[PDB]
Structure 1
Amino acid sequence: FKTIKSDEIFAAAQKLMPGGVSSPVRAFKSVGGQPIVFDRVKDAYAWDVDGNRYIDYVGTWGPAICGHAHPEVIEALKVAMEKGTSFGAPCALENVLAEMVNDAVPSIEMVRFVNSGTEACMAVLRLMRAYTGRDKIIKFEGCYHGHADMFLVKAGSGVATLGLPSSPGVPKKTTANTLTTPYNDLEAVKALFAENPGEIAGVILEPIVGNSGFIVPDAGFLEGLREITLEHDALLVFDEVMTGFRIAYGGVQEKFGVTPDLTTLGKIIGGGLPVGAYGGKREIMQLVAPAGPMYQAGTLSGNPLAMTAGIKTLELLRQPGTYEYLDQITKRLSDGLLAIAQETGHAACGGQVSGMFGFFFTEGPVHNYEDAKKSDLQKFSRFHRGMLEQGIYLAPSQFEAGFTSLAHTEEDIDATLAAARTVMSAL
């Protein structure tokens, strides 16, 4: 397995950028070895700089649900760019995507496009506070909502993967308004409320965790959170940057049937380009400039190219059988990985909901962040490298959900199982 070119480019990158990467999660610091430098991607595949071909399960961390370089999307962007990529003034396309989104997401009645999930989450951090008049926020341990200062507390994603402490550089003053609780622990939530009466602005959570591994909410947890927040006039905010348009067209809130007050969107909504969004009840959204007092701006927000990409993407997902196919092929995968784990004598747990799955090297079951931390990280490290040499590309971390796409085929699924069998037969 040669990775000579990747090694050359990565080495160079390290003198130019911190850690040689543009995002901490791309670091192979925990999975052993160095990162693979991509060259191009298409459908369910990705090719590196040394010519090795891989079946992709990272899907650029979420956006590629329709498959990489989807022809219908790239032709729409080819035509689009002829007219300019950014205007700095309104454009009809913003109206089209805005309308599609209201229709798609149950809680969204008014929307505001932004440039990333991190931007969406920061904005909503502010609106949750501006609308309720309270300063404190409850976020769960292991969840991730961008890198805004206040969210850098018990964060999942690369902070988990890399074993980083909370922060550095964010004042105690600001971080003190962040109340944390273990995921799935309703009692812990009620305790924070009745201990800080009239102080909690709201609760923000990933409705289905993807950043501390794949963790589904316990029965009654989401309905319960809906209950305690209505009771104390607090806001229920869903961060659907990762689950939006993936678990279902309307996301987890539509699937599980629980409607929050505000939800943040990202990844899939951009279609491969930088696009984020936050929206919710009209009376809350009314506080955003230029309608209300809360000022939130962005130069490239709502630009034509980005709008074009999300539009075509949503139109593809809207096709019949979309989510039925994803569930079907993803179920075969998760189940298969589990059967092999057992067959080859390995403690493992995991599961899937539509096109998102997870696989842990631990007896489990996994309910929160502390549970996930019990997986065998050394086993995982050896299994990742093994899968990599067999031509399967998985996220370099035990703490990240895995993704499947409409471009993946039964064949691709089967070759992954065949490789998993081979890799796990050793370990």
Structure 2
Amino acid sequence: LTPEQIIAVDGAHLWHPYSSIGRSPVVAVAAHGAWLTLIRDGQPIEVLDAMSSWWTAIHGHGHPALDQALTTQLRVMNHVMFGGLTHEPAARLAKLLVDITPAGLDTVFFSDSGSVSVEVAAKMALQYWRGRGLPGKRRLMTWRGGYHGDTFLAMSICDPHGGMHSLWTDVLAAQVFAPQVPRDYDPAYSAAFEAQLAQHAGELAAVVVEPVVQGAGGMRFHDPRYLHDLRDICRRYEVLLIFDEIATGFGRTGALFAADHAGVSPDIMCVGKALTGGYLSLAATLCTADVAHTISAGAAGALMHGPTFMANPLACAVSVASVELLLGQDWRTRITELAAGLTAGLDTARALPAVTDVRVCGAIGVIECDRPVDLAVATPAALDRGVWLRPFRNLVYAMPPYICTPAEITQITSAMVEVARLVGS
């Protein structure tokens, strides 16, 4: 199909994320390394994938080690049902994940998406307490500003304004919300968290939060010491702690997992997005031996979940290679250099009239503006500078692939500054 044919089919038949039908998307024809080939005015152009294709492409696109791992597995076994059978890609990836995740996370449940992995995490927590004779422990607690997925349980712990909990009035589970976690450490926030949690301890299965960085809820950072507090509160009140690392995982925040900034091990952990280096959909939910054994000795004798494509060989194979590629290099220095690039490149944005904040955490760079960013202005402006940038609400932000050179980062940040300049005029 020609680009124009793609556009016509797309307008008539394709739903996009969080969009309408009939209300225009740009045709993508190739991706290699940190670059996308986009069709603009009928002409192909090379642009930097500053978004990492939504947090996903940590090693860039078409990485030879990830391409090879995919075709190698494809020669041997595309997929087998995980009911009654096991295989090497599942075992290799499970061993990897157990070894590099915070200590005590010994078991691995594979699924096909972040939202599903979160539903699995919530299921683990509910079955765990049912295994302990305490079925009253069934609500969830989080702080505001969060995002945990699009499925209906997941939605219930998303920020009530963010995921607009009306028009979902009498539809979502009614969960417990503490106020927005602030950027700077404040003992009084944690004390209030504890006091509110104390009021619901007997009905709470778990606290679920994104550690250090809150992503789709507004690219906010908080002090990792709150995570230390969350761990202590959850211990003392016997509530499980769940870390949603679907966005933060695999080095993105400057640590291998964001939990590491605090030295904290959650009881349950979700990963996804960068898991496969952005080739294929995959997610994982990990829990402690204790959680696993308590579920398994319960009335059900099992975790009552099992996606059809569970532990798909092809997805697991590329993920193994993506993880090994990350571990086998000096990823910490890579991420540190990237953060300094973002920091230096975004400095001048602080002086712009419409800019309220500039913040960087690992390979995450954020220009917070004073009004919603108009995509009809922002997207073509960044395309003009040879960069794929998609703003969100009042945020001009980037999360570049790790393979981006210093020059490419500076090109990304320039385009971000120029986009921010345009919002102000």
TM-score by length of structure 1 reads: 0.83
Q: From 119, 140, 146, give the equivalent of 1:137.
A: 140
Q: Match for 2:271: what amino acid?
A: L
State the match for 1:44 in structure 2.
Answer: 34
- Classify 1:281/1:302 alpha carbon distance in 2 versus 1 (closer, same or farther; 3 Å): same
Distance 2:404 2:150 in 1: 31
Q: From 389, 410, 417, give the equivalent of 1:414.
A: 410
Distance 2:255 2:349 in 1: 32
State the match for 2:9 in structure 1.
Answer: 12
State the match for 1:321 in structure 2.
Answer: 330
SS in 2 for 1:155: coil
State the match for 2:25 in structure 1.
Answer: 35
Superposed displacement of residue 292, structure 1: 3.5
SS in 2 for 1:298: coil
SS in 1 for 2:355: coil
Q: Match for 1:54: what amino acid?
A: V
Q: Deviations over 1:220-240 (max 9, x none)?
A: 311111121111100111000
Q: From 60, 71, 85, give the equivalent of 1:67.
A: 60
Superposed, 1:122-271 pairs within 5 Å as: 122-132=119-129, 133=134, 134-153=137-156, 155=158, 160=162, 165-166=164-165, 168=167, 171-172=170-171, 175-176=173-174, 178-184=175-181, 185-207=189-211, 208-218=213-223, 220-246=225-251, 247=253, 250-271=256-277
Q: Deviations over 1:146-179 (max 9, x none)?
A: 123233247359x84xxx622656854x512x11
- Classify 1:286/1:16 alpha carbon distance in 2 versus 1 (closer, same or farther; 3 Å): farther
SS in 2 for 1:52: strand
Q: From 390, 399, 416, give the equivalent of 1:395.
A: 390
State the match for 1:95 in structure 2.
Answer: 91
Moved more, 402-411 or 232-241: 402-411
Superposed, 1:361-400 pairs within 5 Å as: 361=369, 375-378=370-373, 382-398=377-393
Superposed displacement of residue 197, structure 1: 3.8
- Classify 1:79/1:99 alpha carbon distance in 2 versus 1 (closer, same or farther; 3 Å): same
**1:104 counterpart = 2:100:** yes
Superposed displacement of residue 345, structure 1: 4.0
Superposed displacement of residue 265, structure 1: 0.9
Distance 2:310 2:380 in 1: 39
Moved more, 55-64 or 213-222: 213-222
Aligned residues: 395
**1:118 counterpart = 2:115:** yes
Q: Where does structure 2 lack aligned partners over 5 or more consecutive residues?
A: 182-188
- Classify 1:219/1:79 alpha carbon distance in 2 versus 1 (closer, same or farther; 3 Å): closer
Q: Match for 2:301: what amino acid?
A: G
Q: Deviations over 1:22-68 (max 9, x none)?
A: x22xx599xxx932221121111111134122111111212211111
Q: Deviations over 1:366-416 (max 9, x none)?
A: xxxxxxxxx411477644442233221123413686312222111112223
SS in 1 for 2:36: strand
Normalized per residue, which structure has more strand?
2
Q: Is the CA contact 2:254–2:335 (under 8 Å) kept in the aligned structure 1?
A: no
Distance 1:82 1:243 in 2: 33
Moved more, 279-288 or 183-192: 183-192
Q: From 252, 259, 275, give the equivalent of 2:282.
A: 275
Distance 1:212 1:28 in 2: 21
Distance 2:257 2:241 in 1: 15
SS in 2 for 1:49: strand
SS in 1 for 2:24: coil
Across the aligned residues of Structure 1 and Structure 2, the Cα RMSD in angstroms comes to 2.9
Distance 2:30 2:274 in 1: 19
Distance 1:69 1:55 in 2: 14
Distance 1:7 1:352 in 2: 39
Q: Match for 2:147: what amino acid?
A: Y
Q: From 47, 58, 61, give the equivalent of 1:54.
A: 47
State the match for 1:369 in structure 2.
Answer: none
Distance 1:286 1:16 in 2: 47
Q: Is the CA contact 2:115–2:149 (under 8 Å) kept in the aligned structure 1?
A: yes
Distance 2:89 2:102 in 1: 21
Q: Where does structure 1 lack aligned partners over 5 or more consecutive residues?
A: 362-374
Q: Match for 1:348: what amino acid?
A: T
SS in 2 for 1:269: coil
Q: Is the CA contact 1:211–1:401 (under 8 Å) kept in the aligned structure 2?
A: no
Equivalent pairs: percent with the same residue? 22
SS in 2 for 1:329: helix
- Classify 1:9/1:187 alpha carbon distance in 2 versus 1 (closer, same or farther; 3 Å): farther
State the match for 1:295 in structure 2.
Answer: 304
Q: Is the CA contact 2:36–2:46 (under 8 Å) kept in the aligned structure 1?
A: yes
SS in 2 for 1:328: helix
Q: Match for 2:51: what amino acid?
A: V
SS in 1 for 2:205: strand
- Classify 1:342/1:63 alpha carbon distance in 2 versus 1 (closer, same or farther; 3 Å): closer
Q: Deviations over 1:292-313 (max 9, x none)?
A: 3321112211121111111000
State the match for 2:185 in structure 1.
Answer: none
